[PDB]
């Protein structure tokens, strides 16, 4: 039995249909002079980013469903996630749809310069 609820895909399709994104993500006060990296131990937003509490931007945390990997582990909870200011109306959507460059720590396509 290969049945596995696919919440990531259900949320993306909910957004595409024109559904209002998950709200009440926890936005932090910070200097906005930070390194700009994607997921950090304290708020780290730069001039064009907002910083949020990790758990509140995790689809799995927010929906009370399991995390998709063998260990139950969440890489957002207990950290802070930097969201481009133009995408901060949907931090959950953003963290789902994007990937963190494993060498510079930035969002691929939103600060990562390693492929120039």
């Amino acid at each position: 039995c290969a049945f596995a609820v696919d919440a990531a895909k259900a949320y993306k399709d909910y957004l595409a249909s024109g559904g209002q994104p998950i709200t009440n993500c926890v936005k932090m006060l910070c200097t906005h002079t930070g390194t700009g990296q994607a997921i950090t131990v304290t708020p780290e937003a730069n001039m064009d980013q907002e910083s949020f509490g990790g758990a509140s931007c995790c689809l799995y945390c927010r929906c009370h469903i399991d995390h998709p990997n063998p260990k139950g582990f969440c890489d957002l909870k207990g950290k802070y996630v930097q969201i481009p200011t133009t995408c901060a109306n949907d931090p959950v959507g953003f963290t789902l749809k994007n990937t963190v460059c494993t060498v510079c720590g930035m969002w691929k396509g939103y600060g990562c310069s390693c492929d120039q």
């Binding site: 009440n24 993500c25 926890v26 936005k27 758990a55 909870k77 207990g78």
Partner: protein, 296 residues
């Protein structure tokens, strides 16, 4: 003007009065502060609380232990915990709890009434936002409340390390005489009103550097009457100014010493080090917590 502070602490002369309890009637009752774009009241509020705590002699040991009661919101997240985790040194053990379910950035979360929470270890800092809205009944006498306050007084006495500190939310009607009396068991205490919520009778009762014994005798009925009198005669201008300068926000890593000492072995020299925010007295074992579960 205090509009550039994070908030206003109760002046010492108001603590020394013997007022009788009146109804709280705030001048700025109707007003609201304009928060920075997209910032929640609970984030602004805890930020200002932490900015004020930055001015006290908090003990900040390595492997600091912080527990936060009343941390859930009606929207299922923990904004106050997120600020505490931002404020506390990286690696600080932060435990979370609330009656209702929520997701949290804390190292561990316990769901249920706080009276079901037990911990083996002692703590360096206790934060409480617990509040029952059913206490704002304007039509009966405002007496000392128990509920969760009874747990909190016991928890401080049994599980707060000497030298540790406390910040417990109160309001006009949500308060407790023994908790005020316990403030006299610290080297110093105040009632702190955040500038962003200064239109509310809420305050945080802050005990700074626990001493385990009475330093002052405090009548908690008189002291809450004094607190209301201060609030009634001292309109506080709503302000979010301090929210815009976060450059010095993180709690200063003081490396405060931790010792395991026994009740007959606490000098006036020790008491004095406790009073200065230079000593934490507790065991340094592993942190173990549990929630009691009633089965049918």
């Amino acid at each position: 003007s205090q509009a550039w502070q994070p908030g206003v602490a109760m002046p010492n002369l108001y603590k020394m009065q013997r007022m009788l309890l009146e109804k709280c009637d705030l001048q700025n009752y109707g007003d609201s502060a304009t928060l920075p774009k997209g910032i929640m009241m609970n984030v602004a509020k805890y930020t200002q609380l932490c900015q004020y705590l930055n001015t006290l002699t908090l003990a900040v040991p390595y492997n600091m232990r912080v527990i936060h009661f009343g941390a859930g919101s009606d929207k299922g997240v923990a904004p106050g915990t997120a600020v505490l985790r931002q404020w506390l040194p990286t690696g600080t053990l932060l435990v979370d709890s609330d009656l209702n379910d929520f997701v949290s950035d804390a190292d561990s979360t316990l769901i249920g009434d706080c009276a079901t929470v037990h911990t083996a270890n002692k703590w360096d800092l206790i934060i409480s936002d617990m509040y029952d809205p059913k206490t704002k009944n304007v039509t009966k006498e405002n007496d000392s409340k128990e509920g969760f306050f009874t747990y909190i007084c016991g928890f401080i006495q049994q599980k707060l390390a000497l030298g540790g500190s406390v910040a417990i939310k109160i309001t006009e009607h949500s308060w407790n005489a023994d908790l005020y009396k316990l403030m006299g068991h610290f080297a110093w205490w105040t009632a702190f009103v955040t500038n962003v919520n200064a239109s509310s009778s809420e305050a945080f009762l802050i005990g700074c550097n626990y001493l385990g014994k009475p330093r002052e005798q405090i009548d908690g009925y008189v002291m809450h009457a004094n607190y209301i009198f201060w609030r009634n005669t001292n309109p506080i201008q709503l302000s979010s100014y301090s929210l815009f300068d976060m450059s010095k926000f993180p709690l200063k890593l003081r490396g405060t010493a931790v010792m395991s000492l026994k009740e007959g072995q606490i000098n006036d020299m020790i008491l004095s080090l406790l009073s200065k925010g230079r000593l934490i007295i507790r065991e340094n074992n592993r942190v173990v917590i549990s929630s009691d579960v009633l089965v049918n």
